[PDB]
């Protein structure tokens, strides 16, 4: 008289916190609760009331034949740090599994537009051993943190949490037994560019702009020597930035500004020497005090395509 | 049936290891939980002590020992020694040593003069307040000899609260849980940051105003770059020591004001050299100092 239909599992995910982004590894940490509910065969409980079984005691019930399927985080890195866990067994057959978890999760993250980047933090959940003929997800609900003021937070959550329930078919695996039910949660976020605009981009602009002042010096010697102090100032600034900003395998927006600075100061050095060593006149072409910042900003504009 | 009254005592040995970026901190302490069960027989009708691995054998045999969760603990806490004390009258005392990472909202915008509130939130993991309720909470903290050697200065005795958390996603009166909340108020020890960071920065920013006392447009403009370069050289000295934050602090704003002041002087110096030989505006040896302090006071309005 068995029931061979798939077991419908309802899932709720409570996300406490997302943090600890690691840019090079493209990972992030998630702390929260996972709640899974399904209906089994009815049972007798003490006093015909719901029965609570915590932590180690859960293992005793699995040994007695209680079915408690393992649900794997597909995109977790290593074994997640599972805290308290609990089962609730109802007389009518309901079974609810609840667990606190902390894990590091991976996803495709693109930081090229840093510090103005947007990211999709994703949770992917799937049964470890049971295909969708035995265990299928029926619904997914996600509850996040109530935010007071976002100006203090590194990331700003734009929009409600998106969810999906799909099927994953594996070729490497009877017919119709190679398909697993998967839940996908997505939290869209946008970085807080404030800190990076005032402490990094703005001071770097004043530096590059300040380097354009070499054209206002009234001597070749003064123009060429001060340029070297400017160059030294961009290099000293590249260290300050690299020491704080995240490591990546590609350049960001700030990295390109720094390169633009190197190019500006190097270009000015070639112009200072050409003007002075092409003729014997020089001071008049050095009156490019306006032409240089425009050419930089001009190129600076076509870089934004 | 009435809920079990659980009395709680939390001893805090140490709070340290602040992670500014993650807004976390470590807490070493003991947690004591006492309630009254059914009477029982014990050896010599005296209290029975059960330690560590032996606890599991009583639970497997029916002894009720509810799991109390730290709501704001990051990851599983490091639990050391733990014991039960089972009295024949039914009383049960659970005692355990813990080291855990705990989180809460932390604002470092007034660094190095910031003030923080270290919190522990405790709640039963499975039993609602109709089944298990916290009847009282007491906190005991370290007796400080002298705080001059400490990173944080504790201010006031520990604050406590016992409230009820109502969850809307558990559907009668069975969706409220009892929560303990402990709060330790502390202020940052600013001595080091005052003398080795803020003070040298004021000297560097003030010394950049010396360019106005040079008697040559050549000297004034060239030396402005050595000053700009000094603020940069100081930037990675602060960046290498001050905490990593996703926002600017006080010191950071000073550093930015420094960049602007020096950059302003570059413009004024150039503006003076082509306006009319304007040694009168070059006598802005007081305007620049005054303008900076004015904008500086406004910066610290928070």
């Amino acid at each position, epitope marked *: 008289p068995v029931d061979a239909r798939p077991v419908d599992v309802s899932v709720s995910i*409570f996300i*406490n916190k997302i943090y600890g982004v690691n840019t090079l590894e493209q990972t992030y940490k998630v702390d929260g609760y996972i709640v899974a509910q399904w209906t089994g065969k009815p049972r007798k409980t003490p006093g015909d009331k719901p029965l609570i079984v915590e932590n180690t005691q859960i293992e005793r019930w699995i040994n007695n034949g209680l079915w408690v399927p393992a649900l794997e985080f597909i995109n977790v890195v290593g074994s997640p740090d599972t805290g308290n866990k609990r089962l609730m067994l109802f007389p009518d057959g309901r079974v609810i599994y609840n667990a606190r978890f902390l894990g590091s999760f991976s996803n495709d993250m693109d930081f090229r537009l840093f510090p103005f980047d947007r990211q999709q933090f994703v949770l992917e959940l799937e049964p470890f051993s049971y295909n969708n003929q035995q265990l299928r997800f029926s619904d997914i609900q996600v*509850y*996040t*943190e*109530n*935010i*007071d*003021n*976002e100006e203090i937070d590194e990331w700003w959550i734009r929009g409600k949490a998106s969810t999906h329930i799909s099927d994953i078919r594996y070729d490497h695996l009877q017919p119709n037994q190679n398909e697993f039910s998967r839940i996908t949660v997505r939290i869209d976020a946008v970085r807080n560019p404030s800190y990076y605009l005032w402490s990094f981009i703005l001071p770097l602009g004043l530096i590059i702009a300040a380097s354009w002042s070499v054209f206002w010096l009234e001597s070749f010697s003064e123009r060429l020597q001060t340029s070297f102090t400017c160059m030294l100032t961009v290099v000293a600034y590249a260290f300050y930035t690299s020491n704080i900003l995240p490591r990546l395998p590609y350049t960001t927006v700030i990295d390109q500004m720094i390169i633009a600075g190197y190019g500006s100061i190097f270009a000015a050095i070639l112009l200072i020497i050409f003007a002075h060593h092409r003729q014997a006149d020089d001071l008049l072409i050095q009156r490019s005090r306006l032409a240089f910042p425009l050419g930089f900003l001009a190129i600076g504009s076509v870089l934004v395509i | 049936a009435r809920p079990v009254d659980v009395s709680v005592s939390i001893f805090i040995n140490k709070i340290y290891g602040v992670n500014t970026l993650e807004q976390t901190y470590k807490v070493d302490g003991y947690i004591v939980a006492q309630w009254t069960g059914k009477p029982r027989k014990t050896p010599g009708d005296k209290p029975l002590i059960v330690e560590n691995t032996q606890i599991e054998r009583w639970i497997n045999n029916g002894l009720w020992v509810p799991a109390l969760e730290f709501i704001n603990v990051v990851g599983s806490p490091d639990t050391g020694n733990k014991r039960l004390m089972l009295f024949p009258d039914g009383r049960v005392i659970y005692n355990a040593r813990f080291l855990g990472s705990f989180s*809460n*909202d*932390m*604002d470092f915008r007034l660094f190095p003069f910031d003030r*923080q*509130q*270290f*919190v522990l939130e405790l709640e039963p993991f499975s039993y609602n307040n109709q089944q298990l309720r916290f009847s009282d909470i007491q906190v005991y903290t370290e007796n400080i000899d002298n705080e001059e050697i400490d990173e944080w200065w504790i201010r006031g005795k520990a*604050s406590t*609260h*016992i*409230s*009820d*958390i*109502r*969850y*809307d*996603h558990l559907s009668p*009166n069975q969706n*409220e849980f009892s*929560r303990i*909340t402990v*709060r330790i108020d502390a202020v940052r020890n600013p001595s080091y940051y005052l003398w080795s960071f803020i003070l040298p920065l004021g000297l560097i920013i003030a010394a950049s105003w010396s360019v106005f006392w040079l008697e040559s447009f050549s000297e004034r403009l060239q030396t402005s770059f050595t000053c700009m370069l000094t603020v940069v050289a100081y930037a990675f000295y602060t960046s290498n020591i001050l905490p990593r934050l996703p926002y600017t602090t006080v010191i950071d704003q000073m550093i930015i004001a420094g960049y602007g002041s020096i950059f302003a002087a570059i413009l004024l110096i150039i503006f003076a050299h082509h306006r009319q030989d304007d040694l009168l505006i070059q006598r802005s040896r007081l305007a620049f100092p005054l303008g900076f302090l004015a904008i500086g006071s406004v910066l610290v309005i928070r």
Partner: nanobody
Amino acid sequence: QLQESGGGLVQAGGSLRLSCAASGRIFSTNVMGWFRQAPGKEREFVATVGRIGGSTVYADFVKGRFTLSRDNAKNMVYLQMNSLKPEDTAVYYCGARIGGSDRLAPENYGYWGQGTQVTVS
């Protein structure tokens, strides 16, 4: 600025619906909480929203008798108070959380309202 209303005199066992109008820079009603202060006693917490979605924090004396709700459209919160008893007589204030790390601490609230009196016989 905050303004309360909905107080008054009620018979032991009756109900009241306090209202708190919020005006100004307030992105969400989550920051708002209810307090009460009887003559001679200290201002004690009553209710505010919980950190995680779906949760609400209530003082231990509430015992399920009060219910905090919010109307983000009108930018407001309501305290539905039932089964009132003489012990609940006090001035009920509405506050706005201005930082800190303790939802239940009056010290972390500013912009208090004038308060609205609740009196139970």
